[PDB]
Design a protein around this motif. Structure first.
Motif, mmCIF file in Angstrom:
data_model
loop_
_atom_site.group_PDB
_atom_site.id
_atom_site.type_symbol
_atom_site.label_atom_id
_atom_site.label_comp_id
_atom_site.label_asym_id
_atom_site.label_seq_id
_atom_site.Cartn_x
_atom_site.Cartn_y
_atom_site.Cartn_z
ATOM 1 N N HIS A 180 -24.799 24.876 -24.789
ATOM 2 C CA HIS A 180 -25.102 25.969 -24.427
ATOM 3 C C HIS A 180 -26.467 26.200 -23.690
ATOM 4 C CE1 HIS A 180 -27.667 25.052 -27.919
ATOM 5 N NE2 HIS A 180 -28.436 25.918 -27.562
ATOM 6 N N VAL A 181 -27.165 25.226 -23.786
ATOM 7 C CA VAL A 181 -28.692 25.472 -22.947
ATOM 8 C C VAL A 181 -28.030 25.264 -21.607
ATOM 9 C CG1 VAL A 181 -30.044 24.744 -24.800
ATOM 10 C CG2 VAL A 181 -29.394 23.041 -22.899
ATOM 11 N N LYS A 182 -27.383 24.136 -21.347
ATOM 12 C CA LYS A 182 -26.792 23.998 -19.945
ATOM 13 C C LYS A 182 -26.247 25.123 -19.249
ATOM 14 C CE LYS A 182 -22.871 21.962 -17.388
ATOM 15 N NZ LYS A 182 -22.211 23.271 -17.144
ATOM 16 N N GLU A 183 -25.527 25.919 -19.988
ATOM 17 C CA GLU A 183 -24.978 27.140 -19.476
ATOM 18 C C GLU A 183 -26.083 28.020 -19.232
ATOM 19 O OE1 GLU A 183 -22.068 29.817 -18.006
ATOM 20 O OE2 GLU A 183 -24.393 29.948 -18.393
ATOM 21 N N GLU A 184 -26.987 28.247 -20.102
ATOM 22 C CA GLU A 184 -28.070 29.051 -19.862
ATOM 23 C C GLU A 184 -28.803 28.623 -18.842
ATOM 24 O OE1 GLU A 184 -29.041 28.433 -24.430
ATOM 25 O OE2 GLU A 184 -30.368 30.067 -23.702
ATOM 26 N N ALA A 185 -29.163 27.246 -18.759
ATOM 27 C CA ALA A 185 -29.934 26.796 -17.529
ATOM 28 C C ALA A 185 -29.158 27.373 -16.011
ATOM 29 C CB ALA A 185 -30.134 25.086 -17.463
ATOM 30 N N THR A 186 -27.918 27.234 -16.173
ATOM 31 C CA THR A 186 -27.164 27.781 -15.135
ATOM 32 C C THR A 186 -27.566 29.010 -14.827
ATOM 33 O OG1 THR A 186 -25.419 26.061 -15.537
ATOM 34 C CG2 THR A 186 -24.776 27.833 -14.141
ATOM 35 N N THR A 187 -27.380 29.984 -15.728
ATOM 36 C CA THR A 187 -27.839 31.419 -15.465
ATOM 37 C C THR A 187 -29.333 31.420 -15.149
ATOM 38 O OG1 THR A 187 -26.388 32.167 -17.390
ATOM 39 C CG2 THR A 187 -27.921 33.810 -16.698
ATOM 40 N N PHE A 188 -30.223 30.450 -15.705
ATOM 41 C CA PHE A 188 -31.525 31.061 -15.453
ATOM 42 C C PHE A 188 -32.096 30.485 -13.974
ATOM 43 C CE2 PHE A 188 -35.575 28.743 -15.617
ATOM 44 C CZ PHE A 188 -36.534 29.817 -15.931
ATOM 45 N N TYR A 189 -31.608 29.546 -13.488
ATOM 46 C CA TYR A 189 -32.276 29.249 -12.021
ATOM 47 C C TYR A 189 -30.993 29.355 -11.122
ATOM 48 C CZ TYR A 189 -31.065 24.450 -13.054
ATOM 49 O OH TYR A 189 -30.418 23.292 -13.424
ATOM 50 N N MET A 190 -29.895 30.058 -11.507
ATOM 51 C CA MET A 190 -28.673 30.387 -10.379
ATOM 52 C C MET A 190 -29.049 31.633 -9.719
ATOM 53 S SD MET A 190 -25.869 28.503 -10.025
ATOM 54 C CE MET A 190 -26.313 29.335 -8.586
ATOM 55 N N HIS A 209 -26.347 18.315 -10.304
ATOM 56 C CA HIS A 209 -25.141 18.895 -9.643
ATOM 57 C C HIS A 209 -25.654 20.561 -9.719
ATOM 58 C CE1 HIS A 209 -21.175 20.938 -9.953
ATOM 59 N NE2 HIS A 209 -21.138 19.941 -9.177
ATOM 60 N N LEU A 210 -26.327 21.072 -10.349
ATOM 61 C CA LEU A 210 -26.552 22.761 -10.111
ATOM 62 C C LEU A 210 -26.918 23.007 -8.671
ATOM 63 C CD1 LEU A 210 -25.862 25.174 -11.535
ATOM 64 C CD2 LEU A 210 -27.899 24.892 -12.778
ATOM 65 N N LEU A 211 -27.826 22.084 -8.151
ATOM 66 C CA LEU A 211 -28.442 22.239 -6.772
ATOM 67 C C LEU A 211 -27.179 22.415 -5.709
ATOM 68 C CD1 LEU A 211 -31.302 19.867 -6.436
ATOM 69 C CD2 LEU A 211 -31.526 22.125 -6.918
ATOM 70 N N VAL A 212 -26.111 21.691 -6.045
ATOM 71 C CA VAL A 212 -25.042 22.005 -5.124
ATOM 72 C C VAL A 212 -24.392 23.573 -5.430
ATOM 73 C CG1 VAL A 212 -22.408 21.399 -4.845
ATOM 74 C CG2 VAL A 212 -24.013 19.402 -5.657
ATOM 75 N N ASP A 213 -24.346 23.963 -6.432
ATOM 76 C CA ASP A 213 -23.975 25.163 -6.720
ATOM 77 C C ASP A 213 -24.682 26.173 -6.137
ATOM 78 O OD1 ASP A 213 -21.857 24.251 -8.141
ATOM 79 O OD2 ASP A 213 -22.715 24.465 -9.973
ATOM 80 N N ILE A 214 -26.205 26.143 -6.270
ATOM 81 C CA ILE A 214 -27.184 26.945 -5.750
ATOM 82 C C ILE A 214 -26.934 26.985 -4.316
ATOM 83 C CG2 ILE A 214 -29.575 27.162 -5.142
ATOM 84 C CD1 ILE A 214 -29.931 25.989 -8.248
ATOM 85 N N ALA A 215 -26.703 25.819 -3.446
ATOM 86 C CA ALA A 215 -26.657 25.693 -2.276
ATOM 87 C C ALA A 215 -25.362 26.589 -1.706
ATOM 88 C CB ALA A 215 -26.075 24.406 -1.627
ATOM 89 N N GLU A 216 -24.311 26.735 -2.636
ATOM 90 C CA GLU A 216 -23.179 27.661 -2.303
ATOM 91 C C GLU A 216 -23.646 28.868 -2.152
ATOM 92 O OE1 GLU A 216 -20.731 24.829 -1.799
ATOM 93 O OE2 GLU A 216 -20.537 26.818 -1.037
ATOM 94 N N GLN A 217 -24.340 29.511 -2.881
ATOM 95 C CA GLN A 217 -24.958 30.837 -2.763
ATOM 96 C C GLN A 217 -25.808 31.184 -1.530
ATOM 97 O OE1 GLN A 217 -25.080 32.036 -7.427
ATOM 98 N NE2 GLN A 217 -26.982 32.358 -6.392
ATOM 99 N N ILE A 218 -26.308 30.058 -1.193
ATOM 100 C CA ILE A 218 -26.890 30.178 0.018
ATOM 101 C C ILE A 218 -26.187 30.372 1.137
ATOM 102 C CG2 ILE A 218 -28.598 29.017 1.698
ATOM 103 C CD1 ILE A 218 -29.673 27.321 -0.748
ATOM 104 N N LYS A 219 -25.132 29.841 1.133
ATOM 105 C CA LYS A 219 -24.082 29.809 2.244
ATOM 106 C C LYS A 219 -23.496 31.244 2.055
ATOM 107 C CE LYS A 219 -22.060 25.320 3.058
ATOM 108 N NZ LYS A 219 -20.897 24.448 2.943
ATOM 109 N N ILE A 220 -23.444 31.753 0.939
ATOM 110 C CA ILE A 220 -22.982 33.376 0.805
ATOM 111 C C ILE A 220 -23.972 34.201 1.444
ATOM 112 C CG2 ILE A 220 -22.508 35.288 -0.652
ATOM 113 C CD1 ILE A 220 -21.347 32.912 -2.831
ATOM 114 N N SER A 221 -25.195 33.940 1.248
ATOM 115 C CA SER A 221 -26.408 34.758 1.987
ATOM 116 C C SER A 221 -26.604 34.512 3.410
ATOM 117 C CB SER A 221 -27.653 34.419 1.082
ATOM 118 O OG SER A 221 -28.460 33.038 1.571
ATOM 119 N N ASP A 222 -25.956 33.557 4.105
ATOM 120 C CA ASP A 222 -26.221 33.343 5.553
ATOM 121 C C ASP A 222 -24.726 33.375 5.870
ATOM 122 O OD1 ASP A 222 -28.998 33.565 5.218
ATOM 123 O OD2 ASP A 222 -29.198 31.418 5.041
#
Length: 796
Positions: free
Chosen positions: A482-492, A668-681
Motif C-alpha cells: 500500500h505505501v508504494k501506491e501511496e508514494a506514487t500518489t504522494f510525489y506523482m 522506476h517512479l522517476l520514469v512515470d513522473i517524466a511521462e507527466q512532464i511530456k504531457i505538460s510540454d
C-alpha cells in the motif's frame, strides 16, 4: 592427467641418478608442499610407484608411529622383524636375526641399559656390547644387506632383484616440533647412508626445529654476544645441505600455482566429469555451457556471486582479499564442499523465490568467513566483530567507527573532519562516515598491511548484514505494498504520508534495522561530485523557503537529495531517513545518492522488485563495494548533469550486476513522473532521465539563495546583515506577503522607491506608517527595521 606428474618424474630422476652409485652413499629426498587430501596424495601414490619399480618400501612412518616415542631405528627394526615373521631361507634369516640382536644391543647400550652401566665390577666381555654401539654403522649395513637378501629370496618366478629399501616419513608438517629434531639426528646417525629416506615436511620446519634446540644449546654464547642467530642458522644450513642435497628436495603446489590454474583442472583432478556450469553450480555430464577456464582466483568471487548476490572482488587490490579464497588444496576441496549448490540463484523462472535461499547462503558464507578469519585476529578484532554482530542494529556503526579510529591512532604518534566523530551519537554516524574513515585510513601516512584487510573484512561483514536485512525486508513485502501506491500518489503530483511511512516501518523490524545501518547516507558527507577544484563555494546548500512558493515536484527534491532537516543541540538525530518537514529560510545540505536509502523510496523499490517481472531490477544498497564504485564515478548545467548521472549515468560497474536482472534502475517512479512532464510540454530512457534532471535542476536553482534574494538587490543594507542570509530571506518573504494582501507592487529599485511604496501602503494601514516613520532619515536598511518589518507583516 595426474597433477603432480612433474614431481613424480623428478623423484624418478633422482632415484635413477643414485641407482648408479652403489658404494653406501648418503641419499635422501625431501618433499615439500600440499601433497594431500582425497585420493591423489603424492605420498601413497609415490609409495605405489616405488613398489612397482622393485623398491622395498617400509610401511609409512606417520605421526602415529612417531608418537610411540621410539627412535626411527627401533621402528625400522620392528618393521624388519614383522616382515620376516610374515613368512617362514634359514641360511640368511639366522644372520639377519643375529644382526637384529646386535642392533638391539647397540640401542640398549646407547640407552645406558646394559649391565656395563649398572655393575660395580665390569667384566671384559661386556666391552663387546659397547663395541656393538661404537660400530653400529657396520652392523646396520649388514642388517640391511641381509634383509634385502631375504626379501630377494621370497620372490617367485624370478621376477627381479630389489633395488633398495625406502623409508617415508609422512605428515611431518606438524609433529610436536622438537620430536622431528630427534628424528633428524636419528636419520643422521643411523639411516643417513643406509636407505632412501623421504622426509615429506613443509617449508622451513626443519630449520626452525633445529634452531629450537641449538638456541637453548647456545644461551651463553648468544647473551654474551659471542654469536648471533646467523651462526646457528649457518650451522643448520650446512647440516641440512649435507643431509638432503638441494637437488634432492622437491616442492609442489603452493598457493601461487594453486590460484593461477583453472577450476576445471582442479575438478578434473577430483574427477574428469566434474565441472562448473554457467550458474557456477557443479555439473557432471557435459553442459557445453560450462565455464571451466576462469581460474580459481576469480571463480571464487564469481561463485560467491550467484549464491549471495554479492560482488566481493575489491577495486583496490591493497585490501588483501586473496587471504580468503583457498590457501591449500584441502581448503579448496572443503570450500567446494561448503559451496557446491547452496540453492544457487539462477537466471530462470520468475526471479521471486531466490530471495529466501539467498539470505541463508549469506549466513553460510558468514560462517565460512568467520572460520577463515580466525588466524591473524588476536584480541581486539574478535571482540570488535563479536560485539558488532550483537550490536542490535544501530550501535554497530558507532563500534565500527571507534574500531577504525583505534587503527588510525596506532599510527598518528609516529585535523580532518572524518576523524572528528568520536564524541558523536551512534545515530549521527551513518554508513557514509564509516566508508569515509576507511578511505582516509586507506590514505593515511601510517600503518598498512593488516589494516587494509581489516577494512576489507569489515566491508564484507557490512555487505552481508545489509543484504540479509534487505532480503528479510523483501520477504515481508506484502505488509507495505500500500505505501508504494501511496508514494506514487504522494510525489506523482504530506503529514499523513509520513505517519503512514512510520507505521509501516514499525511493522517490519528488519526494515528498521536496515534503515538504521545506513542511517541516511552511505556516501561520505564530504564528497566532491565535481572534479574541477576543491568541493564547492555554496553549491550543496539550499533554502526551501515556503510551501506556497515551492515549485512543482518539490517533494521529489526533498527525498532524493535532501536527507536531513537541520540548519546545516546534543541529542539530535541530524539525519531522519524518514520523510522530512522543513522550516522556512533554513540552509540544508544536499546528498545526491540518498534516494536508495529513504524509507518510502526503498519500500517502493522493494515492492517493484517483488511484483514486477520484466528485465530491470531496482537498485538496492546492499554492498559497500557499490560505494567503492560510486566514489570512482565521474559525475561530470552542473547540477542537471550530476542529477542525470544519479538517475541514468550510473546505470568496476560489474558489481551492479545482480543475480536477478540484466540492468539496474534507480527508481522506476522517476520514469512515470517524466511521462507527466511530456504531457505538460536506450534513447527514450536517456530522454526521460534528462527531463527529470532538468526539472530537478530548475527546482534546485529556484530554491537557491541567489534567486530568493534576487529581488533584494538594489536595496542598500548595513554591512552586517549581508552575512545573515536567513533574515534577508525572511525580509523578502515579508515584502511579498505585504504586497499580496494590499496589491500595491512594492518597488525595490532603491530605498527611495521602497519608502514611497511603504507610505502608499501606510496611507490605509496604520501599522505600516510606523515603519515608514522609523525609516524617515535612514540611508540604508538596518537590522532593527527589517526585524520590525517582519513582525508587522507577520501580525498584519
Amino acid at each position: 592427467n595426474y597433477i603432480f606428474s612433474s614431481q613424480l618424474d623428478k623423484v624418478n630422476l633422482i632415484l635413477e641418478h643414485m641407482d648408479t652409485v652403489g658404494g653406501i652413499h648418503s641419499r635422501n629426498i625431501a618433499i615439500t608442499g600440499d601433497r594431500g587430501t582425497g585420493k591423489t596424495s603424492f605420498i601413497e601414490t609415490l609409495k605405489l610407484v616405488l613398489e612397482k619399480q622393485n623398491y622395498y618400501v617400509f610401511d609409512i612412518v606417520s605421526p602415529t608411529v612417531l608418537s610411540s616415542h621410539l627412535n626411527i631405528l627401533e621402528i625400522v627394526i620392528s618393521s624388519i622383524y614383522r616382515e620376516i615373521d610374515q613368512f617362514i631361507d634359514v641360511h640368511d634369516r639366522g644372520r639377519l636375526i643375529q644382526h637384529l640382536k646386535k642392533v638391539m644391543n647397540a640401542i640398549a647400550v646407547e640407552k645406558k641399559q646394559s649391565d656395563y652401566f649398572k655393575q660395580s665390577k665390569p667384566e671384559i666381555e661386556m666391552l663387546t656390547d659397547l663395541s656393538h654401539r661404537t660400530f653400529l654403522d657396520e652392523e646396520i649395513k649388514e642388517l640391511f644387506c641381509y634383509f634385502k637378501k631375504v626379501l630377494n629370496n621370497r620372490q617367485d618366478s624370478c621376477k627381479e632383484v630389489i633395488k633398495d629399501l625406502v623409508l617415508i616419513i609422512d605428515d611431518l608438517d606438524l609433529v610436536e616440533n622438537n620430536l622431528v629434531y630427534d628424528l633428524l639426528r636419528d636419520i643422521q646417525h643411523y639411516l643417513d647412508s643406509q636407505l632412501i629416506v623421504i622426509f615429506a615436511y613443509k617449508e622451513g620446519q626443519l630449520e626452525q626445529s633445529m634452531f629450537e634446540h641449538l638456541a637453548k644449546g647456545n644461551e651463553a654464547l648468544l647473551n654474551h654476544g659471542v654469536i648471533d642467530s646467523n651462526a646457528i642458522f649457518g650451522q643448520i644450513e650446512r647440516f641440512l645441505t649435507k643431509l638432503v642435497p638441494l637437488s634432492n628436495r622437491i616442492p609442489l603446489f603452493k598457493q601461487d600455482e594453486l590460484l593461477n590454474k583453472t577450476i576445471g583442472e582442479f575438478l578434473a583432478s577430483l574427477d574428469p566429469s566434474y565441472g562448473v556450469g554457467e550458474n557456477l553450480e557443479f555439473i557432471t555430464k557435459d553442459s557445453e555451457k560450462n565455464k571451466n577456464n576462469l581460474t580459481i582466483r576469480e571463480w571464487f568471487y564469481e561463485s560467491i556471486f550467484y549464491r549471495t548476490n554479492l560482488k566481493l572482488d575489491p577495486i583496490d587490490i591493497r585490501e588483501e582479499a586473496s587471504r580468503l579464497m583457498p590457501k591449500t588444496l584441502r581448503e579448496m576441496v572443503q570450500l567446494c564442499e561448503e559451496l557446491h549448490s547452496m540453492q544457487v540463484i539462477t537466471r530462470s523462472m520468475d526471479k521471486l523465490a531466490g530471495v529466501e535461499g539467498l539470505r541463508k547462503n549469506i549466513g553460510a558464507f558468514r560462517r565460512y568467513i568467520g572460520y577463515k578469519n580466525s588466524t591473524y585476529f588476536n584480541l581486539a578484532t574478535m571482540e570488535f566483530f563479536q560485539k558488532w554482530e550483537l550490536a542490535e542494529s544501530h550501535q554497530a556503526n558507532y563500534l565500527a567507527y571507534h574500531f577504525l579510529m583505534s587503527y588510525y591512532q596506532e599510527s598518528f604518534e609516529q585535523s580532518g573532519y572524518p576523524l572528528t566523530l568520536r564524541t558523536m551519537e551512534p545515530y549521527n554516524i551513518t554508513l557514509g562516515d564509516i566508508y569515509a574513515l576507511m578511505e582516509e585510513l586507506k590514505y593515511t601516512e601510517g600503518i598498512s598491511a593488516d589494516t587494509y584487510y581489516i577494512v576489507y573484512i569489515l566491508k564484507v561483514y557490512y555487505s552481508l548484514r545489509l543484504s540479509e536485512l534487505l532480503y528479510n525486508v523483501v520477504l515481508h513485502h506484502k505488509l507495505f505494498v500500500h505505501v508504494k501506491e501511496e508514494a506514487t500518489t504522494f510525489y506523482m503530483a504530506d503529514k499523513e504520508y509520513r505517519e503512514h511511512i512510520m507505521t509501516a516501518i514499525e511493522k517490519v523490524p528488519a526494515l528498521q534495522a536496515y534503515l538504521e545501518l545506513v542511517n541516511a547516507q552511505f556516501m561520505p558527507q564530504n564528497f566532491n561530485y565535481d572534479r574541477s577544484g576543491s568541493r564547492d563555494d555554496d553549491f550543496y546548500l539550499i533554502s526551501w523557503l515556503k510551501d506556497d512558493d515551492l515549485p512543482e515536484y518539490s517533494r521529489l527534491f526533498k527525498s532524493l537529495f535532501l536527507n536531513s532537516e537541520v540548519a546545516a543541540f546534543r541529542y539530535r538525530n541530524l539525519y531522519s531517513y524518514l520523510p522530512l518537514q522543513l522550516t522556512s529560510a533554513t540552509f540544508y545540505k544536499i546528498d545526491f545518492l540518498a534516494f536508495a536509502i529513504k524509507a518510502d523510496l526503498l519500500m517502493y523499490n522493494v515492492v517493484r522488485f517483488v511484483e514486477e517481472e520484466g528485465d530491470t531490477i531496482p537498485y538496492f544498497m546492499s554492498n559497500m563495494f557499490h560505494i567503492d564504485v560510486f566514489v570512482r564515478h565521474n559525475y561530470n548545467g552542473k547540477f542537471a548533469y550530476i542529477a542525470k548521472q544519479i538517475v541514468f549515468g550510473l546505470w568496476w560497474y560489474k558489481s551492479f550486476d545482480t543475480v536477478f536482472g540484466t540492468k539496474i534502475e534507480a527508481l522506476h517512479l522517476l520514469v512515470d513522473i517524466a511521462e507527466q512532464i511530456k504531457i505538460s510540454d536506450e534513447q527514450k530512457r536517456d530522454e526521460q532521465a534528462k527531463k527529470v534532471a532538468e526539472k530537478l535542476a530548475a527546482i534546485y536553482h529556484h530554491i537557491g539563495m541567489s534567486r530568493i534574494l534576487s529581488r533584494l538587490h538594489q536595496l542598500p543594507f548595513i554591512a552586517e546583515i549581508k552575512s545573515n542570509k536567513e533574515l534577508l530571506q525572511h525580509f523578502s518573504e515579508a515584502i511579498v506577503k505585504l504586497e499580496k494582501y494590499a496589491s500595491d507592487t512594492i518597488n525595490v529599485g532603491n530605498l527611495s522607491q521602497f519608502r514611497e511604496s511603504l507610505k502608499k501602503i501606510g496611507q490605509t494601514y496604520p501599522s505600516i506608517q510606523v515603519l515608514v516613520d522609523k525609516l524617515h532619515r535612514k540611508q540604508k536598511l538596518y537590522v532593527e527595521f527589517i526585524q520590525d518589518f517582519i513582525e508587522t507583516v507577520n501580525k498584519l
